[PDB]
């Protein structure tokens, strides 16, 4: 009877709803962070509902039969844990309430069980993770190898600091270190670069450096970043490398090591970033995406007065006028948005009013049509259509504005979408947004639930610590901008980590909360959180997606152009011509002799190219010559060079253009594109996709405009602040509250300045730039601080007054970056798919010769058995062969290599001699055993041993290993030069590589990387040329800019070596915001227009704001386009290898 | 807020040694110039406080006449420990013992209060 | 920014000449105060007699007749941290020939460190009656022409051989 009642209670429509409603309410309570005492009673009730809900299920299912029905399901295990925990706490409990309390967050997980269909989504997510097993192994191995290389090459390097040369009272470097521990005390002693947290990193070599005179370089003390950033230990090196792989603030690690290590080591980073980061991340996407398709597709496959009104009313319907009246309105809407686009911080009084008058007319017209619209079809008919309801809400808002949060008013701009119905692509963007809250609504909901659990979990665990510690983290003694103290704040940190910004925040948590706790939480958010985000992106994207002597002469010239020596000769000139470009720069004044030959050398080049062009005309004729795209490019370049030469000989030079014209030379490397077969193929693919890219860009521009317009209304003119010029610190606002007040201070004070941000929302054009930084996550935080801080147009900003304006940025990122990028990626890859289909289903990234080679590599995939080999007749020879052949013996060798690998890991900075000696000796035994194995295989195998490819790699490794040990030893006896020695040891890492032979899963992935090398090479060549043209433009244009942020000695545009280093850094668009900033400032007091620049003719160090913006922005976009290509090339090959 | 752990009531037999144990907990690492600890005694709840031991760079024992030479420091502050020892406790030692700890850079000042009762 | 460039070694007689001595600080950010001394010993004679001292903003010139008049500062101006010290002579004369040694004294202000440093740049110049074109300029111009002539000869050379062959082909058929 009771069981029937309970069972009756268990399955009911209301009960599932009741259990769920309480749970959502419970979540609001977790967010309290210091709930009042009275709330405690409420806490009891939640405990009561769960037991009751929990008790009935257990009572009915069990039948006092051990709760067999109840505990059989996995989810129920979770409920039992929660009930005991609430109950356990009342009972004697463990000491850490916060650690113990954190469990309560588990109730939130219950929500997953209650909501219908959520259980299915979570299961779907777990299935995807299983596919990722091989990639995980390779990633750990890859990160591990680089960590070993990084540790050997850079250990102890981050330690360098400039220690002053003269010390009073017979003090010693050693004596000084133990006695003092204070930033103020430390500053007197080591250099410290004007307010940086830590001492300047110095270098031994000529390339790195440098310390000011009177300061010498010695290595002592903690690594920069609280000691967190160091290459000293394997664990620390591993963290540093993991950061590089995910590219989080990777630029600083790169800048820091290069400075201490020297620029020559830039090579290490290029290989790691290029192979380790671009490639590894791509592999993860392919596997997740590939895995998603099987499950998505596999599941899908299984399924398959009164009379007057009528006269008047009939007339209104005729008035719908779809051919013209409906169409006419859209023109009106487009015009209206354009009207709204005009705004600025400084607006004249007459202009400000005109905008107001103009808005009313538009507001009236939209309403009249709506009121007018209603009469023609009747109200019920009128509200039937969804767009109508959508249009209606906007019109109503405007009417209320006149009499009855003015921001909502800024909101009428959405109206702009209406055009979506007409536009094919816009319709697609509308479709994508719908899918997230539509079919994929359950999946999107999970992301929301997970973000919520983490924000609360982080808050419970580290909330108290941030407040008490504050000081370890902040000099001031106040909370930092990013912290985990409150739910909104805790939430912001979690959201930041979804974008790859985890490292900066983590150092802060670690100082206050300790290393073990902070590391575990952040690592989980990053891995678990990102997997869900990745799934949503991929899931969303895929679902959405689905005499006449003259004639003889003419013939002959044709013969000359066609001939190989000539084609070959011309190419040499192009490389040579391009190379001469690199020499020019700030150091050209020195080495006057090279300058003279180069100037003369160009003239010979100009003559050769002009001469070559004439041959082209005779051989091809004008019609053939000008119908070619390449020739026009080629013809145009000779002309610019030709004009400068004629103008130059004549004199009458340096008067702007032609002088501006000289800078146009950087275009010379451009003719190289036509000559190389590999480079041309890649370019053809891009041209194929520009029209398609153009369509997406239009949608992005229209979409971004609404955000930009919205942004302008909210923050236009509010970013100004009064700052102390010496340290750039905003005044309190207790004093100097408004701009008017700030000026009075200047009149009686020397260094106070009232100044704008430089990248802001003052006008619509600027807003677009501000948005671009937020979209890329570079330089975004400086802007956000400004937005929240802001109060009014002529008033000094208070600290965190707005606080909720953060929401604006969060919404833009989700819509502006997550959705559009989803759209950008979807169209580009698809367009690439169509191109492949057109050219007979053949890869479009390789030259014809490359294709033959690609096929040969395909052959290596086959497993046909090779000959077994015959044991030699001799038993002595045979047993060894017999022993060697056995698989068990091979497993032993695999174990031995792993043992060897662990030995390398134990090495650490400042280990000591006894420790150092043992490692050296253990290493020797390893070399002997490995050499021993090689000899044994050889005795039994004989000629057969050389047949296998792997055996040869194994044999080669042994030769390198013995030589590496001996050479290091000879080097030690000979001495002189430590650096050659570290590189020499790098040979041991070779043995670790043999591990790949053992693992079948990792090898398949590795084979895929090898297959795509030909395609990647062509893109790499094209990418290199573009980087080269930009470096040249940069050297002439940006050398001499004042050094501010991101531009300092090294990592500057002063010379070609330097320019290349920067361009590589920005290829990933990291720190692009920093380099651009010095270029932006123009006029006093930002910079001095005329500066002496000893040793050179040029005057002033002012960036060209217009030229600078085009240059950085164009580069960011172009590099991104090519990188999309790497993503495309890797995916194609990966599907093929896995597919086999 | 500095974390302070002391027994609210400490009952000790006349003539025995009384360790007054208090725990102070705060983030950071203690600084000798920076760390300051003060101990005061009161005969009763409303009674004037008499400082009897301080830490300022080092331990300073004020040698109050009311304690003779029976007060000793009994704690390693670097351990968050600032306990004191009252040897050979006498009936007049009954009262309130206050520990005040101010630790730079921590702005907050910890306070522990022990009611010492002397048996018979 | 600052670059170090060596001064020209030949001065035409009866014409103005500029001597370049440029010294660059290791780090641009650091700020220090500089002063300079230039000492010149005429050719055929041992030793150096200081000719000028430049400290603060004013330039002090020695009273010796060889350089009396004829000298103007072309150094960094108003900086007080010169970096570039150069001397310009008007009406160059034979008497102005020999070895020039320029020493720099720099006060660098650090957080609690004050550093005094000395760097010596010596400039040697010989007066000549007529400007002599640099050898590099002459060799390159002559060298460039040969290339222009050789390439053209090569191009014309192929046509005579290639063209004749082409003409021959038409006749055979
Ligand atoms: C702007 O900030 C500067 C830099 O701290 C302030 O200058 C300090 O002023 C105090 C008293 O005037 C001096 O004792 C310090 O030595 C100064 N610092 C240095 C190193 O110069 C300055 O007070 C601020 N400006 C105003 C107008 O308050
Ligand atoms: C801008 O801020 C100033 C500073 O408070 C305001 O002007 C006055 O400030 C003085 C102090 O010198 C007070 O005695 C006055 O009471 C302030 N004004 C008034 C009317 O009380 C000023 O009002 C602020 N707003 C402006 C100038 O736009
Ligand atoms: N301030 C800002 O833009 O925050 C984002 C993040 N943080 C920094 N301190 N950076 C240094 C320069 C930079 O570009 O702003 C950045 N470098 C990377 N990789 N992301 C940026
Ligand atoms: C070295 O230190 C000693 C202190 O024992 C001092 O007497 C001596 O003068 C110092 N040496 C020099 C060269 O100052
Ligand atoms: C400084 O304020 C004084 C008032 O004593 C005024 O005379 C002077 O003009 C102000 N300075 C400037 C640059 O306006
Ligand atoms: C010394 O003790 C007194 C108690 O009377 C207290 O108010 C004061 O803060 C203490 N001194 C310091 C430096 O903490
Ligand atoms: C040039 O040198 C001679 C002798 O060395 C001297 O008599 C003469 O005065 C010098 N010329 C000038 C202009 O001082
Ligand atoms: C060097 O001095 C000459 C003398 O008139 C002066 O005209 C010239 O401008 C100076 N150099 C510079 C700074 O241009
Ligand atoms: C050079 O010196 C002579 C005196 O011998 C003087 O007449 C002439 O004006 C000077 N040259 C110039 C350019 O002033
Ligand atoms: C260093 O400065 C002092 C000032 O006390 C000065 O006398 C001395 O000449 C300077 N050193 C050098 C090498 O110029």
Swiss-Prot record, chain A:
It is a multi-pass membrane protein. Changing residue 401 to A: No change in inhibition (IC(50)) by the spider protoxin-II, but has a significant impact on channel activation by shifiting the V(50) towart 0 mV when targeted by protoxin-II. Inhibited by tetrodotoxin. Weakly inhibited by saxitoxin. Inhibited by the spider huwentoxin-IV that binds the extracellular loop S3-S4 of repeat II. Inhibited by the spider protoxin-II that binds the extracellular loop S3-S4 of repeats II and IV. Inhibited by the scorpion alpha-toxins CvIV4 and AaH2. Inhibited by the conotoxin GVIIJ. Inhibited by the spider beta/delta-theraphotoxin-Pre1a. GO terms for cellular component: axon; axon terminus; node of Ranvier; plasma membrane; voltage-gated sodium channel complex. It catalyses: Na(+)(in) = Na(+)(out). Disulfide bonds join 162-211, 471-477, 509-518, 722-742, 1087-1102. Residues 60-72, 115-128, 376-384, 423-439, 623-624, 677-689, 830-886, 940-948, 1000-1012 are cytoplasmic. GO terms for molecular function: voltage-gated sodium channel activity. One of its GO terms (biological process) is cardiac muscle cell action potential involved in contraction. Changing residue 1015 to E: In PERYTHM and PEXPD; hyperpolarizes voltage-dependence of channel activation; depolarizes the voltage-dependence of steady-state fast inactivation; slows channel deactivation; enhances persistent and resurgent current; enhances neuronal hyperexcitability in dorsal root ganglion neurons. Changing residue 1015 to D: Depolarizes the voltage-dependence of steady-state fast inactivation; enhances persistent current. I repeats lie at residues 1-297. The modification Phosphoserine is found at residue 862. Belongs to the sodium channel (TC 1.A.1.10) family. Nav1.7/SCN9A subfamily. This is Sodium channel protein type 9 subunit alpha. It comes from Homo sapiens. The chain holds residues 114 to 1768 of 1988 of the full protein.
Swiss-Prot record, chain B:
The record marks 28, 107 as: Binds SCN2A. One of its GO terms (cellular component) is node of Ranvier. Residues 4-120 form the Ig-like C2-type domain. One of its GO terms (molecular function) is voltage-gated potassium channel activity involved in ventricular cardiac muscle cell action potential repolarization. It comes from the Eukaryota. Glycans are attached at residues 14, 38, 46. Disulfide bonds join 22-99, 44-47. It is a single-pass type I membrane protein. Keywords: Atrial fibrillation, Brugada syndrome, Cell membrane, Cell projection, Disease variant, Disulfide bond, Glycoprotein, Immunoglobulin domain, Ion transport, Membrane, Phosphoprotein, Signal, Sodium, Sodium transport, Transmembrane, Transmembrane helix, Transport. It is found in: Cell membrane; Cell projection, Axon. One of its GO terms (biological process) is response to heat. It is linked to Atrial fibrillation, familial, 14: A familial form of atrial fibrillation, a common sustained cardiac rhythm disturbance. Atrial fibrillation is characterized by disorganized atrial electrical activity and ineffective atrial contraction promoting blood stasis in the atria and reduces ventricular filling. It can result in palpitations, syncope, thromboembolic stroke, and congestive heart failure. Regulatory subunit of multiple voltage-gated sodium (Nav) channels directly mediating the depolarization of excitable membranes. Navs, also called VGSCs (voltage-gated sodium channels) or VDSCs (voltage-dependent sodium channels), operate by switching between closed and open conformations depending on the voltage difference across the membrane. In the open conformation they allow Na(+) ions to selectively pass through the pore, along their electrochemical gradient. This is Sodium channel regulatory subunit beta-2. It comes from Homo sapiens (Human).
UniProtKB/Swiss-Prot annotation, chain C:
One of its GO terms (biological process) is membrane depolarization during action potential. GO terms for molecular function: sodium channel inhibitor activity; sodium channel regulator activity; transmembrane transporter binding. Keywords: Atrial fibrillation, Brugada syndrome, Cell adhesion, Cell membrane, Cell projection, Disease variant, Disulfide bond, Epilepsy, Glycoprotein, Immunoglobulin domain, Ion transport, Membrane, Secreted, Signal, Sodium, Sodium transport, Transmembrane, Transmembrane helix, Transport. Coiled coil: none annotated. Disulfide bonds join 2-24, 21-102. GO terms for cellular component: extracellular region; intercalated disc; node of Ranvier; perikaryon; plasma membrane; T-tubule; voltage-gated sodium channel complex. The chain crosses the membrane at residues 139-160. It comes from the Eukaryota. Changing residue 106 to C: In DEE52; severely decreased channel localization at the cell membrane. Residues 3-131 form the Ig-like C2-type domain. The keyword Nucleotidyltransferase does not apply. The overall expression of isoform 1 and isoform 2 is very similar. Isoform 1 is abundantly expressed in skeletal muscle, heart and brain. Isoform 2 is highly expressed in brain and skeletal muscle and present at a very low level in heart, placenta, lung, liver, kidney and pancreas. In brain, isoform 2 is most abundant in the cerebellum, followed by the cerebral cortex and occipital lobe, while isoform 1 levels are higher in the cortex compared to the cerebellum. Residues 1-138 are extracellular. Glycans are attached at residues 74, 91, 95, 116. Belongs to the sodium channel auxiliary subunit SCN1B (TC 8.A.17) family. This is Sodium channel regulatory subunit beta-1. It comes from Homo sapiens. The lineage of its organism: Eukaryota, Metazoa, Chordata, Craniata, Vertebrata. The chain holds residues 20 to 192 of 218 of the full protein.
